[PDB]
Design an enzyme around this catalytic site. Structure first.
Site: not given
Ligand SMILES: *[C@@H]1O[C@H](CO[C@@H]2O[C@@H](C)[C@@H](O)[C@@H](O)[C@@H]2O)[C@@H](O[C@@H]2O[C@H](CO)[C@@H](O)[C@H](O)[C@H]2NC(C)=O)[C@H](O)[C@H]1NC(C)=O
Ligand SMILES: *[C@@H]1O[C@H](CO[C@@H]2O[C@@H](C)[C@@H](O)[C@@H](O)[C@@H]2O)[C@@H](O[C@@H]2O[C@H](CO)[C@@H](O)[C@H](O)[C@H]2NC(C)=O)[C@H](O)[C@H]1NC(C)=O
Ligand SMILES: *[C@@H]1O[C@H](CO)[C@@H](O)[C@H](O)[C@H]1NC(C)=O
Ligand SMILES: *[C@@H]1O[C@H](CO)[C@@H](O)[C@H](O)[C@H]1NC(C)=O
Ligand SMILES: *[C@@H]1O[C@H](CO)[C@@H](O)[C@H](O)[C@H]1NC(C)=O
Ligand SMILES: [Cl-]
Ligand SMILES: [Cl-]
Length: 523
Positions: A79, A113-114, A195, A322, A433
């Site tokens: 990621w 990625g928030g 997300s 998740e 997730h």
């Protein structure tokens, strides 16, 4: 292969895929580099150029902190950015079928990625399999994240907030204005993301400015009503100010705060983002979407409830586990390297980690709701994972879908429950997730890697996603497949996706979500 765009010519590259060919244009600029005086401002239009811009490699990823919790581990490193970090990162990618299509439906990916991390160049986001297999055009863009993308001083154009969302929007406009030249149909555009990327897709459904920039939407594991998705004006002020202090930029004039922040190096800003919140959680979104009065005109919950959103079809889904991924980033007794059997005491400490500002009663209520054991040493381990997954992702996705469909449109909901045969994380973490993404993008179609059953599953998901984009209906019509029924507030039917047998089920997590959706918001 040169395509003439509104702002200039761009050259692509030919890729060989499954005995066929796909033309890729990686790294087309879509905005003025947001550097210098432009840092923290909405993206500015890009001035034309001549000569041929070579879109033959992924561009820089936007500045962001990296996950260093597991150096050398593929589960986490897959990621992290795989291209140089830089403030000069407003670029997008286009994959088109070959021969060139005549009026192809367009899929636009928005990574998650928030809102603090992510990039469109990750291997799991490679749009070449979809272009090759379903003959759709795939577009993906880099948008600013963290404080550089979401720092907010509501009303002040120097740092209005939601800049990263305006970056996404400007890329959607680029598609409207330029995709026909690539053989795409600007009247058939489907946004898809996961997300924070799914939360972003849901905000474009709410933003009047994005209304005419797309046709349909796909939300994978996220929606704006998730608790981590929208920063309150209160938190945002305190955060922008804490960042100011931490970097020696506190000043009476707010616009002077921004000028000062514009002199700091990206690294000093990144380094201090973490500390802007007194106590964060592994799901903290230090700098995220805010109600800025421009992109977002009012609290999203009110807009959802009162039906103020683009009327169109949606496809929404979540994964079976998740919450597990976050447990190893701070919950006591957890580790990706052992079975993580925790105790009641640890479970309780875990709640403290995930619900920092929650009253003692609030936490006990979570414990009461999730510990009525149906003994088993992994009861507490499994309960904390469900607590984190239900609160942060599943219940909010289900509420979003119910509220959205009550206004008339067809909605389709899936429950993804297949655990990749290649998953680097331990078995106890289950269907994590982010791990449906590779199936959606068709990675398992590449035999050189995955089991036969996964190739088939990925093939069906790819076809359903493509049929949703092109026709607004996620069916696989040729191989005697289970029909995907529409999701309605009453019956609440959803489709399970797995290699074994796909089934039609009803009222996913009914009892758990009544707790999160009705009760918990009160504590
Ligand atoms: C609003 O921010 C204040 C200030 O945060 C502190 O200073 C920042 C620059 C940053 O370094 C943070 O990590 C600091 O916490 C918060 O007040 C703090 O509250 C904690 C409670 O645990 C306390 O220990 C600190 O001393 C307080 N900071 C000071 C010096 O006043 C406050 O919690 C934030 N508001 C909210 C949303 O609660
Ligand atoms: C599972 O591991 C955790 C984490 O411990 C770390 O990683 C292990 C794989 C091993 O390398 C340890 O030496 C590392 O410290 C264990 O949790 C720790 O447990 C001890 C005693 O219970 C406690 O003092 C620590 O604070 C714990 N650390 C954390 C992060 O919670 C856990 O006990 C292991 N569980 C098993 C083996 O079932
Ligand atoms: C773009 O690519 C062409 C062909 O590969 C090359 O001739 C040209 O120099 C490139 N432009 C650059 C590097 O600015
Ligand atoms: C593409 O199809 C749309 C309808 O979705 C139509 O309006 C448009 O003219 C077509 N574009 C082409 C091939 O010119
Ligand atoms: C349908 O079945 C064929 C042959 O049985 C298979 O090759 C193909 O992958 C399937 N198509 C989809 C969309 O699953
Ligand atoms: Cl690294
Ligand atoms: Cl089936």
């Amino acid at each position: 292969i040169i395509i003439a765009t509104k702002n200039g010519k761009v050259r692509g590259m030919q890729l060989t895929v499954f005995g066929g060919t796909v033309t890729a244009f990686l790294g087309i600029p879509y905005a003025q580099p947001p550097l210098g005086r432009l840092r923290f401002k909405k993206p500015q239009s890009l001035t034309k150029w001549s000569d041929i811009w070579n879109a033959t490699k992924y561009a820089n990823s936007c500045c962001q902190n990296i996950d260093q919790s597991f150096p050398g581990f593929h589960g986490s490193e897959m990621w992290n950015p795989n291209t140089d970090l830089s403030e000069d990162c407003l670029y997008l990618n286009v994959w088109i079928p070959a021969p060139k299509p005549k009026n192809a439906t367009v899929l636009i990916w928005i990574y998650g990625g928030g809102f603090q991390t992510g990039t469109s160049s990750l291997h799991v986001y490679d749009g070449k399999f979809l272009a090759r297999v379903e003959r759709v055009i795939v577009v993906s863009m880099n948008y600013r994240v963290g404080a550089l993308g979401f720092l907010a001083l509501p009303g002040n154009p120097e740092a209005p907030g939601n800049m990263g969302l305006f970056d996404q929007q400007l890329a959607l406009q680029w598609v409207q204005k330029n995709i026909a030249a690539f053989g795409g149909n600007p009247k058939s555009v489907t946004l898809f993301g996961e997300s924070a990327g799914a939360a972003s897709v849901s905000l474009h459904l709410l933003s009047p400015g994005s209304h005419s920039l797309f046709t349909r939407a796909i939300l994978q594991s996220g929606s704006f009503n998730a608790p981590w998705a929208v920063t309150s004006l209160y938190e945002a002020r305190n955060r922008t100010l804490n960042l100011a202090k931490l970097t020696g930029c506190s000043r009476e004039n707010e616009t002077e705060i921004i000028k000062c922040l514009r002199n700091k190096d990206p690294q000093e800003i990144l380094l201090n983002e973490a500390f802007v919140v007194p106590y964060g959680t592994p799901l903290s979104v230090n700098f995220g979407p805010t109600v800025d009065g421009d992109f977002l005109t009012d609290m999203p919950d009110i807009l959802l409830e009162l039906g103020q959103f683009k009327k169109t079809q949606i496809l929404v889904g979540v994964n079976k586990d998740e919450g597990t991924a976050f447990l190893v980033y701070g919950a006591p007794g957890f580790s990706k390297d052992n079975n993580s059997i925790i105790t009641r005491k640890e479970f309780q400490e875990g709640l403290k980690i995930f619900f920092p500002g929650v009253s003692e009663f609030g936490k006990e209520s979570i414990l009461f709701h999730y510990t009525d054991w149906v003994q088993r040493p992994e009861n507490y381990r499994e309960a904390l994972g469900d607590v984190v997954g239900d609160y942060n992702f599943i219940c909010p996705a289900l509420e979003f879908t119910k509220k959205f469909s009550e206004w008339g449109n067809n909605a389709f909901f899936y429950y993804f429950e297949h655990r990749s045969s290649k998953l680097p994380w331990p078995e106890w973490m289950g269907v994590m997730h982010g791990y449906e993404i590779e199936f959606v993008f068709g990675l398992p179609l590449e035999r050189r890697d995955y089991t036969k059953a996964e190739e088939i599953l990925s093939r069906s998901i790819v076809k359903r996603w493509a049929n949703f984009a092109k026709y607004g209906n996620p069916q696989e019509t040729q191989n005697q497949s289970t029909s995907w029924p529409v999701f309605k507030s009453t019956e609440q039917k959803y489709l399970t996706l797995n290699t074994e047998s796909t089934r039609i089920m009803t009222k996913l997590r009914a009892q758990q979500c009544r707790f999160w959706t009705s009760f918990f918001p009160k504590v």
